[PDB]
Design a protein around this ligand. Structure first.
Ligand SMILES: [Cl-]
Ligand SMILES: [Cl-]
Ligand SMILES: [Cl-]
Ligand SMILES: [Cl-]
Ligand SMILES: [Cl-]
Lengths: 266, 243, 255, 259, 259
């Protein structure tokens, strides 16, 4: 994390940068960035996934410099997030087809990472707000995860009881939660899910691409209590081991966020 | 002057028992066209809701919408057939349909059938007195989407010759191995204004939302297959217009 | 072509013409044969999808004259959700599985003009012996497998011009606008969109749309959605109807 | 040096043509196809037959004669599409059944669609899969290639100056040249690649560069070039042949003043 | 440097064809990698040097232009992959798709990347397997840990040597590269079709949001690339990366700066 006062004064611009690590499970000390091997074919009535098999959302709160020296003034200053540049880091590491992966056929190279993937990021001045949805409401989730409380069959579609803040890194399983479009007035989020056994990962990098965070009235997220929130999930696909077992692979996400000072009423 | 309303519309995939809400009954295959009698719980239907408004007319101006719970398909540990020996479960994939409508009147639909001789089960509303022409265009088959969980998706499409007071959007992608591709963002808005700058006008102080979101097929360990659907969120901005 | 002068709307649903092998299978073709030698390729009539077309008469408005000018079209394929019936007739994807979706080669095409669509003949196999009731390239040669300029036709009859023999002619059609997409392959997914919010403008670079020459408006289409695979393994083309809503205006022209 | 566009009577013209594909044409009945594909030749003994090799198509269109000593014809737009795309809906003839009782296999697999419009012949750069390929009489291929010819060897410069002679697998348009040509190509490779081809008489490609100047036709000649390999046709035996289709061009030109 | 106005008056272009560095296992297999190994345990993963594609780079020298000084500024780049049609050779080396069929197209995982800057490309290391033992002649992350499989900020490198930095080890660094523009797309998968476009009508603008392009502060311009097109499958079943050269044409102008 770096917080840089690029310019000071009324038109002050501060740039925050950070690399958010993925939280795929990390089943042992040497497989950081991967999940535990996937189980299959568990009956809905006895589906008890292991902690390290479940990728979770990544998140961090980044403290910003205090702007208000007199807290009793009629007008106070807040940091306002105006743009974000972001990309997934280490995509070329998937070109290692010599280590660990099942050969595609006899005498062939290793099988590329492929299959279902999810790429998501958010930037806001409050924690990202999430809605819970489950494949199977009777899944017994493991200690260390935070998942929908008292789920019912309705939790497999929409159960409005399942509201949460993404307020803990490596705790909210990606399979249980989505960003909540009925809330998040102070966050911009973006995600794409692509499902399937053989789905090719497609990932772009460039330092020339910027996303604008301003709403239709020209206001970006406002950093409450001088806190900027970054969230991500970048499940790149499934790594298939020589044995045939499969593990999720994730990669870190870079953020560069440009902020300006907005005057608001107390 | 301006008001916003929102709704989470649940999918109606069939719901074969109390536990399998959001899924259909397992799919039958290979019925002859002359003896095709599908069970009610096997047929996804269109979802719809009528949203009352404060009582000039309310004009629908924009809609924000997205499919809810897409990441739930990352549960590959529960119920699904292994992709190979020692491998994880098979992702939901295959034919899918994503559709929504916003209107001041119920959605107007036209009936088209794969097989006109299909015997549809009690509880569904399907084209009446179908003929072979019902497999192409039979203009007799007009309906209003006036009941939730009743009009099967396979029997009905939005009618482009009507719907003067509704805007609708859908995409059908067919095939066994088709990957679901779903995007979420709170930064996308669809403007509902026509070329004259006029949106859907809510006739009896009612706003109509409609959806179908069949995400693909879930393959059980045994090889059987079931539709999986997801709820759809709507946030509609309305303004008052005099008439 | 002088000033614009007033406004009328026509709409039509054009049925597909996939072959219709019996009275129950409207919208399908006869099952496909395979592996006919080029020297003995005699397709049956009901196996061959043809272009759909209709002529829509308009009011007769007549030194100068007035003509109906086509300005915009809204069009879409009708019944796309019918392909979610995987219980009827289709081969199971595997044991205990649902039926196989319609998929594979598809062609989606429409045209709007004030003359019949002008077409160019091109054939896979020039030696194909086409059946009675079809209108195909006359006196074809090896060159008819590439470009043979002899093969000019008007789409002047419904359910007669096989889709496999004919394409819209880009060297002609001055008074028609046409649009088509061919996607080929064994397992290609059908992808079809619907919305009543999309309009195709028919005006050319000078703001002039198709002009209905003898008070007739022409619509044409082909919407082969893919192949339907029966339990036996036999395959049939499946097609769907196309809707047209065309807005016209009155235009002054010199005689 | 380019001056003002010239307007007036006869300052505009339009030309059109159809360019036939050059896929090999293995016998008198198989126009538009290649000879069946061989496979698995060692790089040291790779001798493709003439009729197995698709070649670029090209033609020169004469324009109304302007005095070369000052005006030149300037190509402004081109309308172009592939002709006969629906012919691939013939699945009854020649093609291997997809399975027992099934229809024939569609044409699919690797494909290349390319066109160019210019006031000079298209300038090409040679690149080879295998520098040791022994090309047959009747083809013009990179001369005296080396191992470097499998990547970039700048000796391999050629003009597309002969129809049905330059194999598509040996040559690409040269981005370091072609100051007076606009070219456009897409290669898609793979066994099962679906052909995707659009037609419409409403789409135009503008040939003007960033200064608003199109190709200038040197001696009242317009050069058109194309390659449209649509995929592989699979015979019932399992053998495979390239299938190609003709391309139509309609080019609009204007007179431009020069010095 | 404080950037002042563009120096106007009676702009230059430089160009380069940058060769791919796929490993080149012998004198005849320029542009390919060594055959790919598979299934090496993470604890004993020792790739041979000729199996590892590396980033390509070149330095283009420029003449010095000199209170206010002048520097060359890169405004636009035209770039494309060279030799894409070479993949239509399905007769040489590749395994037949089925009995009596043609050869298997190049397909599978591919990466296409370029950069243009006034300093060498700045890179960040990320590994599939931190315990990989890389071969002599490669430059790879130093003292990697488990954290090196996600983000380890210690792994910073300059692309300061051609055919040395393995593609699999390094990515352009978005936290640096203030004076370079880079662009890349990774497409992974066993059977991914290559899709490659060529046209001389496409230009990438290298100006930033203030209208300033990369500045050649030490009178040098840097081009960098990786173009792994896919995997070639030999008749034996073995697989090799295939790469192709990348063309660059960069338009430069003179920019005044404060000393
Ligand atoms: Cl909860
Ligand atoms: Cl009815
Ligand atoms: Cl004829
Ligand atoms: Cl040469
Ligand atoms: Cl390092």
């Amino acid at each position: 994390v770096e917080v840089l006062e690029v310019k000071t004064g009324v038109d002050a611009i501060t740039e925050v940068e950070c690399f958010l690590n993925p939280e795929m499970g990390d089943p042992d000390e040497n497989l950081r960035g991967f999940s535990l091997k996937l189980s299959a074919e568990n009956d809905f009535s006895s589906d008890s996934p292991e902690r390290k098999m479940l990728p979770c959302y990544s998140t961090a709160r980044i403290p910003l410099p205090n702007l208000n020296e007199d807290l009793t003034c009629g007008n106070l200053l807040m940091w306002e997030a105006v743009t974000v540049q972001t990309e997934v880091i280490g995509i070329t590491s998937m070109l290692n087809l010599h280590a660990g992966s099942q050969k595609v056929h006899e005498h062939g190279g290793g099988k590329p990472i492929q299959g279902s993937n999810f790429h998501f990021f958010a930037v806001g001045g409050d924690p990202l707000e999430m809605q819970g949805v489950l494949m199977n409401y009777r899944t017994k989730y493991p200690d260390g995860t935070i998942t929908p409380k008292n789920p019912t069959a309705q939790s497999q579609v929409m159960n409005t009881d399942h509201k949460a803040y993404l307020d803990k890194n490596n705790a909210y399983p990606v399979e249980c939660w989505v960003p909540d479009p009925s809330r998040n007035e102070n966050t911009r989020y973006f995600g794409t899910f692509t499902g399937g056994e053989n789905v090719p990962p497609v990932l772009h990098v460039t330092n020339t691409a910027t996303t604008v965070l301003l709403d239709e009235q020209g206001v970006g997220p406002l950093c409450k209590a001088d806190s900027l929130y970054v969230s991500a999930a970048d499940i790149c696909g499934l790594f298939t081991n020589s044995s045939g077992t499969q593990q999720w692979r994730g990669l870190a996400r870079y953020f560069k966020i440009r902020l300006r000072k907005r005057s608001v009423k107390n």
